Design a protein around this ligand. Structure first.
Ligand SMILES: C=CS(=O)(=O)N1CCN(Cc2ccc(OC(F)(F)F)cc2)CC1
Ligand SMILES: C=CS(=O)(=O)N1CCN(Cc2ccc(OC(F)(F)F)cc2)CC1
Ligand SMILES: [Cl-]
Ligand SMILES: [Cl-]
Ligand SMILES: [Cl-]
Ligand code: NA
Ligand code: NA
Lengths: 311, 320
């Protein structure tokens, strides 16, 4: 699973997620990365929502589904202390949730507010051994990547790691901020450099999109395309094969300003599943309500009919 | 769309929902009846949950997804006043949701029950809808006569902008094999024509659920038996008689949740299976015995056949 969250120079947020799902899964099994509220969430500041918030989740277990995790995190991040809010959520759902010996997953989040300046707080958290993240603001111009690990002595699925930072943006240009992740799971010293490199490239693509004036959803899509294309990520190319040796992808994207959503489940034969999810969202804005969630052969046919490259 | 909610004599709740989805929909479009939190919800009483609650939805698919309505209703029903909680949710979280602010009119409905022990069980059941009408049926094991009712928006209300809400309370003896069921056969335009037919399938659906309960079956097996009967009606947009998609083909969504285990099963874009809810229930059942909870399309069909759920291969499509 890979994901990204974006805030543009106006404080509009977006989030996306993409996955190959469980290795050897039964054909047609659709997981959290396709499910509204579970895989990602993005919601601009509103009446009962003082922060514009964007969340993308990772893991395996179904625990991301069972708790409607991304939306849960977004709602918890309305509390004053974001670090404490995220930690409490991870602790209650990935250890003590009523909804198993150990719960494995991860999340990236950001929340912004107007101070014209934008205060962006961004965090990542995981109960897996490790998680690779990258982040970048349009004004720093150098993507930062980092491999987050559980401390020495910790036990995956029984402890929570959480880190983050703060970024202050000028709301006057074509800038913004992006945070990505290339997966949460077992630590691998050997491919650490490759994970960091793809997170670096994914951030640079998202920032370049913002700097050309693109929507937050197009910027978060450009990040996920880069993350998908890495043979090392369980999304797009290199997705885990299912029980029959075939690739079936889940992906979704949400726009914080319009609250619109796009998703695909059990999608085969398309190089970049997030591109189809984004196109479903984009066609939803143009619009009977157009579909937001397509699966299987119907999703493939719709992607091809809309000119999304196949593999 | 059809749905049912059940509570057994112990306060164990279950909920299920089944739909054919939107007429002429693009192949592979999956709606609220397959989606966790959206189509149905069931949650027994627990630490931060004084009531066992069960919810099933109806109506336009995309409005129910964007608002995650079934789960929202279940959480609102933890408040003291269930009638007030449901009405506020329908008004504030559904009609006036910012998630549907672009839409002219918000169309949908819910059935709910919640129970608590006062050994006797107090069951409160309600239905609410923003559509012109909604057909419900309900029954307790001790009354032994199913009641059916077509709920309508009052004169002066505007469909998609007004809320209708009714319900009642039922006290069960928690010493037998009893319980209570509430079903619905659809929410949408009033049709005097098939009004009697919808009422009749709701009555039979309640009777099947109660008979299951009286035979000692789990709440999930009783709610599934209600939905099987509701699906089988040629007049409901679920199972047999489901709306045809853009290619003239059948693609069904269905899901079920168990309040005791909090486990969930669901199918989307399923073709060639007579009773989609049976596959959702079997997924939930095999999950109790990481097992899948949500299968779609070709894989969902193959899984159903491999588990002995009655199929019609002539209704199944698999394009390449
Ligand atoms: C069940 C989950 S999964 O099957 O979606 N998946 C399998 C593939 N994994 C790759 C991966 C990526 C980053 C990472 O972090 C590190 F780079 F080491 F810092 C570790 C592993 C992620 C989890
Ligand atoms: C559910 C969403 S649907 O779009 O799948 N659907 C299409 C099928 N309809 C049948 C139906 C059932 C009951 C009813 O109520 C009345 F009996 F009139 F009281 C009216 C129509 C419901 C709307
Ligand atoms: Cl599986
Ligand atoms: Cl459609
Ligand atoms: Cl009546
Ligand atoms: Na990949
Ligand atoms: Na039917």
């Amino acid at each position: 699973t890979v994901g990204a969250v974006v805030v543009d120079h106006e404080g509009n947020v977006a989030a996306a997620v993409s996955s190959g799902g469980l290795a050897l899964k039964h054909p047609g099994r659709v997981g959290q990365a396709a499910l509204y509220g579970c895989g990602c969430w993005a919601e601009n500041t509103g009446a009962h929502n003082p922060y514009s918030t964007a969340v993308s989740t990772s893991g395996c277990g179904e625990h991301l589904v069972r708790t409607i995790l991304a939306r849960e995190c977004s709602h918890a991040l309305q509390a004053e202390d974001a670090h404490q809010a995220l930690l409490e959520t991870m602790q209650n759902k990935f250890i003590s949730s009523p909804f198993e010996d150990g719960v494995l997953g991860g999340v990236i989040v950001l929340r912004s507010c107007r101070c014209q300046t934008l205060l962006v707080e961004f965090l990542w958290s995981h109960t897996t051994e490790s998680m690779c993240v990258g982040y970048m603001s349009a004004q720093d111009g150098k993507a930062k990547t980092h491999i987050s690990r559980l401390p020495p002595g910790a036990v995956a699925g029984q402890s929570v790691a959480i880190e983050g930072g703060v970024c202050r943006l000028e709301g006057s240009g074509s800038g913004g901020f992006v945070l990505v992740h290339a997966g949460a799971g077992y630590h691998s010293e050997s491919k650490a450099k490759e994970y960091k490199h793809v997170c670096k490239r994914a951030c640079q693509k998202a920032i370049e999109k913002l700097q050309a004036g693109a929507l937050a959803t197009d910027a978060v899509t450009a990040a996920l395309v880069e993350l998908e294309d890495s043979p090392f990520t369980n999304a797009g190319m290199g997705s885990n094969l299912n029980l029959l040796g075939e690739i079936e992808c889940d992906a979704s994207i949400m726009d914080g300003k319009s609250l619109n959503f796009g998703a695909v489940g059990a999608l085969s034969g398309i190089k970049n599943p997030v591109s189809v999810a984004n196109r479903l969202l984009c066609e939803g804005q143009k619009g009977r309500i157009p579909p937001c969630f397509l699966v299987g052969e119907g999703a493939y046919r719709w992607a091809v009919d809309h000119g999304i490259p196949s593999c």
